[PDB]
Design an enzyme around this catalytic site. Structure first.
Site, PDB file in Angstrom:
ATOM      1  N   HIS A  41       0.848  -1.214   0.000  1.00 19.23           N
ATOM      2  CA  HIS A  41       0.000   0.000   0.000  1.00 19.23           C
ATOM      3  C   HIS A  41       0.876   1.254   0.000  1.00 19.23           C
ATOM      4  CE1 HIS A  41      -0.298  -0.162   4.639  1.00 19.23           C
ATOM      5  NE2 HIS A  41       0.174   1.036   4.363  1.00 19.23           N
ATOM      6  N   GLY A 143       2.548   6.466   9.437  1.00 22.13           N
ATOM      7  CA  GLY A 143       3.991   6.356   9.160  1.00 22.13           C
ATOM      8  C   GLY A 143       4.623   5.104   9.778  1.00 22.13           C
ATOM      9  N   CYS A 145       3.594   1.945   9.359  1.00 22.38           N
ATOM     10  CA  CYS A 145       3.442   0.752   8.513  1.00 22.38           C
ATOM     11  C   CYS A 145       4.829   0.293   8.041  1.00 22.38           C
ATOM     12  CB  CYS A 145       2.505   1.019   7.343  1.00 22.38           C
ATOM     13  SG  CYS A 145       0.808   1.363   7.885  1.00 22.38           S
TER      14      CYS A 145
END
Ligand SMILES: c1ccc(SCCN2CCOCC2)cc1
Ligand SMILES: c1ccc(SCCN2CCOCC2)cc1
Lengths: 304, 304
Positions: A41, A143, A145
């Protein structure tokens, strides 16, 4: 003496964290050998995330669109591929701080340490458990991830988790390092509800053993039970069924303390039925389920 | 979202841990520049520890009696001195992994991370607080002495604690890195009882703010109080008095949430007087006091 919720030392994983940027999205990647692993993603606009077609979005991406920074130095991307819900960015430089490592897929009830990172920089380390509903209860802001979960066996880091998303209920979902989600979750901004967050019974029993080893013993009672009787109580209290495999894994703690597993089950049964009556066990007013039998032995024996 | 008991990433400190052996006693040392710091009781036989005269025991020790091993490589000791309750072993090699660092003496209520080590090898990292009675509630087995407590500000490690002893009650005592014990404790195997382990009120309030930020809000009530009224309740419940300095430190959390500090004090007052009634806050059935206001802001804002 004492018993603490303890994470693995994080240095070996700190040496692996990098920043990945694609367009305007920055998150964390894991640099092992000449591959950087990150959530797919990273290629999505917050708009894309409502119903992303990842294969179609990725057609629009070249090697030079993935900006990988390790500290203040840029890595050259020489290939990219999508494996399930992760991207693998081939870089031209092997990470010189690559530890001995494995990728493992853990089972619910298993514990691991998370190195929470932002912009490829470590912020903190904490311990948590794969919940029986395949969520984890983390601490993750935007932030974070690509932050990873791991276990260490002496000098080998087993990576088991990469952070991908927060459910509308504020619990967390992610993948193993082959990009396969734990549980039924998908990397899409949709209604995704978690199932029942049952208590990890074998872990509670392990922690009650830790309590006895550390001198917290008030809850030890005069009773025993059977696996079937205990399991009727477990089901009533949204505890996971206890198996003979769980009984066998608790054997070393049974042996150390001289408390038969089924007697500790009978103590647990009384705590469920009677509550704690304002008393604590190892500084907790609830029954802790994020220590595995292996964790209790490791901490109680001092493994490095 | 989510709120976890989070330790600092431990890599910078991992790079500093060494094994110190004197005769038959092995514990941990901290290697910064060309100095190794370790507890002075490394020179004691378990017999010596009942009433040690450290100056007299040290007369019998030469540089070559202190065996310092960093990984599998021996360091050459070229001097030694005793500063309060620590030994400083001068070695011929500056630690190449020396981080930017300071030595700080913390106040009760302050939190720090512990890297629990055995034989100079890291086993685990956890967060804890200097208790108001100047003990800490750690997880330390024999061989863990010389393990250190620290905070990190970006790239600077502030070392605040070195582990020296376990009290007969299984709580922990140690020094700052100048070898001065926290509280009244001494490095002798004698009766040493801890004073009242009061609750760190400003930290509970910080954690209640963290709860509100993370959507746990059931405990918010319709009341306010005054610092004097609250403090009468605090004294009744063995909570530390709340000062205007504590009120000022909570200002940023008050501002973020729009809950006046004294209103949160009134919520805390009702939780003390009424209990939790079987409900939880951030997955705890008791009021957590090992997060500082600074910790809550750091975690809730994602500082690396
Ligand atoms: C999670 C992540 C990696 C592994 S290694 C075994 C997986 N294999 C091997 C490589 O091809 C795909 C399947 C296990 C769990
Ligand atoms: C604990 C450990 C070290 C310090 S640095 C200031 C201490 N000084 C400076 C050096 O001489 C002794 C006194 C503070 C707290």
């Amino acid at each position: 003496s004492g018993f603490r919720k303890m994470a693995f030392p994080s240095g070996k994983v700190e040496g692996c964290m990098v920043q990945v940027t694609c367009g305007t999205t920055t998150l964390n990647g894991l640099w092992l050998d000449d591959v950087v692993y990150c959530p797919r993603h990273v290629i999505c606009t917050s708009e894309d995330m409502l119903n992303p077609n990842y294969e179609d979005l990725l057609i629009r991406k070249s090697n030079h669109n993935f900006l990988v920074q390790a500290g203040n130095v840029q890595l050259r991307v020489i290939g990219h591929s999508m494996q399930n819900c992760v991207l693998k960015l081939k870089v031209d430089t092997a990470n010189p701080k690559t530890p001995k490592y494995k990728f493992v897929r853990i089972q619910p009830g298993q514990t691991f340490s998370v190195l929470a990172c932002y912009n490829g920089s470590p912020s903190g380390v904490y311990q948590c458990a794969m919940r029986p509903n395949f969520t984890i209860k983390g601490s993750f802001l935007n932030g974070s991830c690509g932050s990873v979960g791991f276990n260490i066996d002496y000098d080998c880091v087993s990576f088991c988790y990469m952070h991908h998303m927060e459910l509308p209920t504020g619990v967390h979902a992610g993948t193993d390092l082959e990009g396969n989600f734990y549980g039924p979750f998908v990397d899409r901004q949709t209604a995704q509800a978690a199932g029942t967050d049952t208590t990890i019974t074998v872990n509670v029993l392990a922690w009650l053993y830790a309590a006895v080893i550390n001198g917290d013993r008030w809850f030890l009672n005069r009773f025993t039970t059977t696996l079937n009787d205990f399991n009727l109580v477990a089901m009533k209290y949204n505890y996971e069924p206890l198996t003979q495999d769980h009984v066998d894994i608790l054997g070393p703690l049974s042996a150390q303390t001289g408390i038969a597993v089924l007697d500790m089950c009978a103590s647990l049964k009384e705590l469920l039925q009677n509550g704690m009556n304002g008393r604590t066990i190892l500084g907790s007013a609830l029954l802790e389920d994020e220590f595995t039998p292996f964790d209790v032995v490791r901490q109680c024996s001092g493994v490095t």
